[PDB]
Design a protein around this ligand. Structure first.
Ligand SMILES: Nc1ncnc2c1ncn2[C@@H]1O[C@H](COP(=O)(O)OP(=O)(O)NP(=O)(O)O)[C@@H](O)[C@H]1O
Ligand SMILES: Nc1ncnc2c1ncn2[C@@H]1O[C@H](COP(=O)(O)OP(=O)(O)NP(=O)(O)O)[C@@H](O)[C@H]1O
Ligand SMILES: Nc1ncnc2c1ncn2[C@@H]1O[C@H](COP(=O)(O)OP(=O)(O)NP(=O)(O)O)[C@@H](O)[C@H]1O
Lengths: 341, 341, 341
């Protein structure tokens, strides 16, 4: 007994960008783009066998499958082999980062990738990812459960396996959760002595074009709220920081940014209207306040549940990035459809 | 309840090309190539759930799967999410073009890709394709059923989303069918104010190497015939046309070509012998009759049905393209096997 | 009735290479690499339908699926369509080479690809592969069974289909087996009048960078042993040879190498400890003894069977290649997990 599952979701999204810099049209406004777009359809195959005592062997293979036909490859979404039992769970493979899992309580919007940032809290989710790694998940001991994860230096860099000439990009991810009477609160974070970021502050493979090496990269997230009684309100606080490691005397200088997000919604019969606010404060790059990284976003919308596996979706979102003249404003809205199986 | 399906088909095909131009061997003849070749194996996953009233949510993910191992990717064959009910059907995703669907009644031959043109009416099928799009399919109202399809400018060109600096390649596909007492007749066509063609007259993505931009591109197909009583006879008429839009004073000049095809077959117990004839008339390119596009093809063959899902196949085909000295003649024959699941 | 199956296997492997030449660290020693690594997870879809008499139609689509997410594509592992019945079996598609099948009795170790050579008898398995081809498998006529396989010139080279200007790389693979009272002994080999090798002596596509064309390439394998009674002992002997066909007066000169391998193991309840020894003799390249191709390897390890589909794995291996100063020594060990479904 092996099981097949997935999700299928598509919809048409509408958007426009207000950017003085790369738009020469009147007043910096882009035209308005109207597109049909897959929202991240997926399809997996998980299974489990009982081992005799409390133990169960477990595995999963999940792939991006976009109904627009733009994906390819196996196990490119969470996939793994593991063992489960008294002690809790132990998994190894392409694994959701403890911070990516905590992303559920923080960004629940559906959208195409060209809009993950305006129609979803994509900016705060920029720290989430999947990593080849080992992960331990503790049982829920009465309100509490815990997760510890680790990524090998030689899995975080494969070419450098035999010559340790590049500093380790091995990282540690760990989380602590608490659920009770609708109440929940969790802490999740990650730390890597050495890592590399692109200019959007997302982590990238060592040696990617224009990656900026960093030291002591750490991320902290804290979410809390209440989910039950046709009711949900969630508040998240995130803190990112690292030192400059790139060649040339900027090295040692501090990078850091703080984001906060809040979302609440209620189910009124089959409709669940929702709303989210998110803010990214000014950032300190190489020790200097850089207002290019500051932003504001609010998203509103609802889902009409045709059934427990099928929903109709709608949302509009607004985003403001940076300040003054380098200002970038994005506005989008969509209507789609999701079917879980 | 989600269902798995597909088809598997392979066979060995034999071929030779008579082309004075790119063959220096005696008299323009190529050697004779003998190959094992996948005929387009595929594998999908479709599903549906009832929604409460006459409505049903529907989806599919179908992928090219060639047993020779040369394919990769998900949803690269018709895949989609849709809703079905009283009003008929509504789908969105990688969708068979209304003209690709009408291809069933017009080219039913199985073959490898290196022979889609001699062992199949591939030339008349050059107007068929799949497009990210929305599609409506009307219920059969007593003999009649109808289909309307549309491809967004921003799905027909994604890079140009925000700068509308390139003319829309958005297109409309629509069909009308009629079935009764074995009798059927359908019209199917498509129209795009702006499109782009390669030299084989097939549509290509804006900006492909050597694509020729065109204006008012329209295709018309008409098929009619009789399928029942161990009996099938089909006749198709197709008309393609467009204006020249490419840079440089050839612009505005007319392109056009007409093709006709005919196929008939009968089931004598488990064998179904079949035969097809197809003709492409001289073409008018930039206002001038170009006999390079004219051709003649006849295909004969049969299928021995081992069971309702398994068949053995055989066919020979002959094709003549262009005239005089630029003449290209292709001849092939194959024997294969197909298994539907 | 179509069936889904596969295997999932991952584990962490540890390794170090002692190579004076490409390591400048003290004494030629590399650092020690510690990696999580997929061992070749896979997932297939096979099926069969009865045809009425003793005959059954059969098919399979099997894909590399690595839980680390590094694979993509369909049918890239054995996949095919075939017919089975009184006469035995007939298959066509991506097919395991008769010599790749005989690989079961000769290399049974699990490992990641970066260690297929030290943690597995990978070196002797260098002659195994999959080829688009047709294959016949005779029924077992009381102890004996047989296999004959063939790869078309036009499937072994596709570009050269119409101009036969390159000599045929078409090859023949054939095997003969015998099983009885735990006893078994098989012969398996292949022969190609023209082929091409890389410097590791593995076969490569015509025209690959740095491939060395060869004439009369033939491989001979012979394995024998006893598997039953919680008992296994296997001995293999292999002989490879070819003539030089590359441009420039080295042509016509003899290449040849001999390898032998031996492995035995016993099941003591759920544990099955195992051990293997393998040796590659000096090689004759262009008529000259080349000790660069000579090697020695011993692998020890066991599998603890959690159940008939789940095992825990462990192994260490040691390998010595070439002689004197060009000497390359590899040592690795791993612990992993496998789950068949
Ligand atoms: N690599 C990525 N880059 C950008 N966005 C992503 C990436 N991976 C996932 N996402 C988005 O973030 C979401 C993460 O998954 P989620 O929303 O929890 O649904 P899911 O993956 O089907 N369920 P789960 O298994 O719990 O993750 C996806 O729906 C994507 O829209
Ligand atoms: N992109 C393409 N280019 C060239 N030939 C194609 C392409 N797509 C499909 N074909 C061929 O045309 C046929 C179209 O599908 P068809 O013959 O109807 O079988 P099917 O796809 O299994 N069923 P359906 O879902 O009704 O299309 C395929 O069998 C292919 O041989
Ligand atoms: N192309 C390849 N290159 C290198 N190693 C390979 C290749 N293909 C397979 N292998 C390895 O050799 C083994 C061949 O398959 P095998 O060990 O018999 O397991 P299997 O493929 O699941 N079963 P079978 O269908 O009998 O081959 C795989 O487990 C791989 O580890």
């Amino acid at each position: 007994q092996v099981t097949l599952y997935g999700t299928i979701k598509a919809g048409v999204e509408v958007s426009r960008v207000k950017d003085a810099g790369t738009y020469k049209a009147q007043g910096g406004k882009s035209k308005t783009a109207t597109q049909i777009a897959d929202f991240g359809s997926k399809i997996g195959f998980k299974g489990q066998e009982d081992l005799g005592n409390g133990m169960k062997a477990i595995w999963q293979l999940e792939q991006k499958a976009s109904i627009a036909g733009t994906n390819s490859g196996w196990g490119n979404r969470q996939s793994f082999i593991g063992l489960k039992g008294g002690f809790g769970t132990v998994r190894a493979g392409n694994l959701n980062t403890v911070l990516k899992d905590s992303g559920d309580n923080v960004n629940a919007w559906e959208s195409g990738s060209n809009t993950e940032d305006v129609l979803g809290l994509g900016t705060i989710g920029r720290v989430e990812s999947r990593e080849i790694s080992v992960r331990y998940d503790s049982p829920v001991f009465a309100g509490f459960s815990g997760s510890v994860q680790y990524v090998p230096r030689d899995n975080a860099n494969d070419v450098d396996k035999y010559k340790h000439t590049k500093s380790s990009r091995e990282s540690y991810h760990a989380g602590l959760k608490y659920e009770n009477a609708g109440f929940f609160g969790q802490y999740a974070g990650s730390f890597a002595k050495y890592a590399d970021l692109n200019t959007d502050a997302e982590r990238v493979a060592v040696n990617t074009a224009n990656a900026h090496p960093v030291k002591d990269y750490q991320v902290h997230r804290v979410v809390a709220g209440y989910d039950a009684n046709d009711l949900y309100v969630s508040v998240a606080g995130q803190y990112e920081a690292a030192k400059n490691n790139e060649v040339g005397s900027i090295k040692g200088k501090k990078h850091e940014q703080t984001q906060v997000a809040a979302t609440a919604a209620y189910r009124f019969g089959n409709v669940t209207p929702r709303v989210s606010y998110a803010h990214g404060f000014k950032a300190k790059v190489n020790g200097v306040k850089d207002a290019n990284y500051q932003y504001d976003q609010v998203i509103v919308g609802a889902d009409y549940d045709f059934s427990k596996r099928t929903s109709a979706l709608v949302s509009a979102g607004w985003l403001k990035q940076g300040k003054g003249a380098g200002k970038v404003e994005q506005t989008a809205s969509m209507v789609g459809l999701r079917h879980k199986f």
